[PDB]
């Protein structure tokens, strides 16, 4: 019997159980339930991580210090190990002797209390051959009488679907609901536990560090309750500081350490950007201009949106940014997004809306098809964002998507989170949302039929307004209208493509140099307002890659490089010279 | 895998809930980190606090084979916990940890392997390392918020196309010895 039941009161003397701070209201009802004549068995029901076992163990702790009523004084609490009780019970009746022997001890003592953690397990603990003789059916007649006191602990899930199924057993237990404490209460809770964590890690926690752990955990750590989230941050900070520096070790735990810990847990940058990454953000816009020419309004919108978030001015419950990039083809709508992720060194989440044309396909984003019994039924968008909280979300050709897809984004842009059918909450507060559409190109390119030409400048927005409902557009941080590439910008584009060609040749050991005059000739051949910069690749392919390709396979370009390109004004044709 | 091991060593040093979890796609070195940690410990490449530490690789199938009784599973499983409780530094490596949530030896009952270890993991009595796929972690795991809370997710992703070459170089001697051949540098790349 001693092996199955662990005396919690004894552990309190040696320190084995953490102290209980607060929970006076919860305990008050528990003592009232325990002092009842019949069915004096409290049941602690609450979400995991909110100190349910701490209250049952805390009672044993408080008894040692004399912080309970006289009626509670002199009472011991026992914790039942179901596995130990069921072990070696192959023979008939073995489980019965151990369970009845335990009950006889409680009934005889008249002052002991049993604490069956995870009480949902005793429903069929002793069932054999589909037998109905179980721990619950045996204990039942001893609970209504009031001879024994039992303290339970079960989440709302397990309680509702397992414990509540047995109406008889559930009646005998009085559900004491435990709500996660407030931020003010959690800091007090950590202050009480802090001396134990400090001793384990041989470190000291500053008062400000404790407050940050609670406040930051609420903001950036989801699917975890507050008293558990903060302890997780506090525990990790002690572990990291203790073993990271072999020498030159900081005994104290500053606020910066807490910020770094939450960053690792949430896979998001911390608030120390003012020193380390200040250079990267300052040069973000400049670097994106070299890669993408023109369209500076889009670069400024993206970089400024990022700066505000890192500086602490970003929206509390909205993504870093939501920008609809609409314009002509080959203007950099889908290039600036791919380069932004590379500049920041963060995962790029690319979703092609061409697939999500129909209503039923939209369900894949937030779940799985109807009745998909097979596993891996998690939404592509929800699971992708959870894996990478810091990332760039690109929804190419959002106009093609079914109107029902805009309803999905309303909670993303305005509330910052999207929930899957299963219920997992995806956080979008730190992802940059960029959508690309060619909605207004047709209207702008349309030519009027009249004596006087019309200024079709606002027609693009009108088309955008029709395709996107006002609620969706309102949530957008800014709508950027990309414009056709100018002739001056094309020169920069030619240089960029040539640079990529040089990199490709560098792999084969060939070096290419082109004259400024030849660059200008290439620009005129490939400058098309409607097609932007994509035609430049075609002329680059036809003019340069074609001769080089033939020579590269067989000729001087096999090795040695030293290529030079020039043209004659009279001939008006490029000349390629290879000298190995 | 210094970044991955550093995060794991930090979790193992926690006062409570010092149970690392290795969540990653298939064949991305999830089990090599756990086994590799044992290899690194033997060679003295870990901190002094982690020295004198033994990793144990529990086999769930062996534990669930031959029970054929009401309490055979609990008898052997609990005995394992007693061993781990006795050795403060002992660590249990349970690959494919999603299986414990599934009834180990429970028929129409909820006395599973996961429930038995929930009190010990919360109290820091035993340290458990688990490896499971993202899809299994998202669907099989994380449903029971109780057990999920104890484990600390460590994302294990493929490092790069180039780092894999370095990895094969370290493994090349073992493979070369097995086949009595030498792999050219160009071939591995």
């Amino acid at each position: 019997t001693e092996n199955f039941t662990t005396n919690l009161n004894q552990l309190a003397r040696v320190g084995g159980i953490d102290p209980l701070i607060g929970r006076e209201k919860e305990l008050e009802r528990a003592i009232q339930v325990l002092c009842r004549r019949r069915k004096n068995n409290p049941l602690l029901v609450g979400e995991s991580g909110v100190g349910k076992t701490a209250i049952a163990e805390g009672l044993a702790w408080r008894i040692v210090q004399g912080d309970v009523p006289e009626v509670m004084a002199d009472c011991t609490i026992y914790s039942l190990d179901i596995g130990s009780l069921l072990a070696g019970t192959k023979y008939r009746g073995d489980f019965e002797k151990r369970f009845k022997a335990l009950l006889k001890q409680l009934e005889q003592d008249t002052n002991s209390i049993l604490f069956i953690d995870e009480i949902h397990t005793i429903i069929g603990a002793g069932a054999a051959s589909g037998g109905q003789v179980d721990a619950a059916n045996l204990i039942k007649p001893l609970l209504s009488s009031g001879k024994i006191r039992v303290i339970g602990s079960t989440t709302y899930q397990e309680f509702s679907n397992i414990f509540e199924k047995d109406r008889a057993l559930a009646r005998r237990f009085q559900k004491i609901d435990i709500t996660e404490p407030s931020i003010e209460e959690t800091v007090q809770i950590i202050n009480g536990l802090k001396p134990k964590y400090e001793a384990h890690h041989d470190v000291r926690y500053t008062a400000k560090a404790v407050r940050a752990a609670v406040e930051l955990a609420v903001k950036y750590i989801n699917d975890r309750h507050l008293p558990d989230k903060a302890i997780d941050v506090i525990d990790e900070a002690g572990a990291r500081a203790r073993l990271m520096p072999v020498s030159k070790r900081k005994k104290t735990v500053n606020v910066a350490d807490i910020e770094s810990v939450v960053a690792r847990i949430a896979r998001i940058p911390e608030k120390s950007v003012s020193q380390s990454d200040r250079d990267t953000l300052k040069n973000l816009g400049d670097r994106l201009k070299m890669l993408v020419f023109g369209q500076d309004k889009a670069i400024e919108a993206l970089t400024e949106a990022i700066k505000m978030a890192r500086a602490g001015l970003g929206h509390e419950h909205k993504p870093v940014g939501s920008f609809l990039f609409a314009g002509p083809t080959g203007v950099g709508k889908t290039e600036v997004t791919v380069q932004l992720s590379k500049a920041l060194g963060i995962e790029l989440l690319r979703f092609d809306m061409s697939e999500y044309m129909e209503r039923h396909t939209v369900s894949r984003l937030i779940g799985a098809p109807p009745g998909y019994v097979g596993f891996d039924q998690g939404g592509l968008l929800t699971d992708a964002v959870i894996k990478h909280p810091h990332a760039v979300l690109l929804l190419d050709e959002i106009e093609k998507a079914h109107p029902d897809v805009f309803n999905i984004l309303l909670q993303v842009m305005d509330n910052g989170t999207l929930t899957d059918n299963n219920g997992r909450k995806a956080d979008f507060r730190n992802v940059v949302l960029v959508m690309t559409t060619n909605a207004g190109v047709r209207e702008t390119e349309r030519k009027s039929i009249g004596l006087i030409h019309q200024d079709n400048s606002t027609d693009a927005m009108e088309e955008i307004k029709k395709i996107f409902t006002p609620e969706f557009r309102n949530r957008l941080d800014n709508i950027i209208w990309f414009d056709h590439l100018s002739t001056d910008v094309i020169h920069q584009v030619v240089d960029k493509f040539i640079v990529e060609l040089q990199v490709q040749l560098d792999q084969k050991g060939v070096s290419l140099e082109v004259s400024q005059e030849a660059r200008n000739w290439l620009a005129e051949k490939g400058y098309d307002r409607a097609m932007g910069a994509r035609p430049m690749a075609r002329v680059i392919q036809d003019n340069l890659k074609k001769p080089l390709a033939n020579e590269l396979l067989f000729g001087s370009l096999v090795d040695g490089g030293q290529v030079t390109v020039a043209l004659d004004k009279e001939k008006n044709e490029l000349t390629y010279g290879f000298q190995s | 895998r210094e970044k991955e091991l550093e995060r794991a060593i930090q979790v193992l040093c926690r006062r409570r809930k010092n149970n690392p979890l290795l969540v990653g796609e298939s064949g991305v070195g999830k089990t090599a980190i756990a086994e590799g940690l044992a290899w690194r410990i033997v060679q003295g490449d870990v901190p002094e606090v982690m020295a004198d530490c033994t990793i144990y690789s529990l086999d769930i199938g062996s534990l669930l084979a031959g029970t054929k009784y009401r309490g055979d599973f609990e008898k052997r499983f609990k005995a394992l916990l007693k061993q781990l409780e006795q050795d403060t530094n002992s660590i249990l490596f349970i690959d494919e940890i999603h299986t414990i949530i599934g009834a180990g030896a429970a028929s129409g009952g909820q006395v599973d392997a996961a429930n038995l270890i929930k009190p010990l993991l919360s109290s820091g009595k035993i340290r458990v390392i688990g490896s499971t796929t993202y899809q299994e972690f998202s669907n099989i795991f994380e449903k029971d918020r109780a057990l999920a809370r104890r484990f600390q997710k460590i994302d294990i992703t493929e490092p790069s196309i180039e780092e894999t070459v370095q990895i094969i170089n370290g493994l090349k001697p073992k493979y070369e010895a097995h086949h009595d051949v030498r792999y050219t540098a160009k071939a591995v790349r």
Partner: peptide
């Protein structure tokens, strides 16, 4: 799976 077992002593 869980089935009770009844034993018998030799004598």
């Amino acid at each position: 799976e869980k089935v009770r077992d009844a034993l018998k002593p030799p004598s």
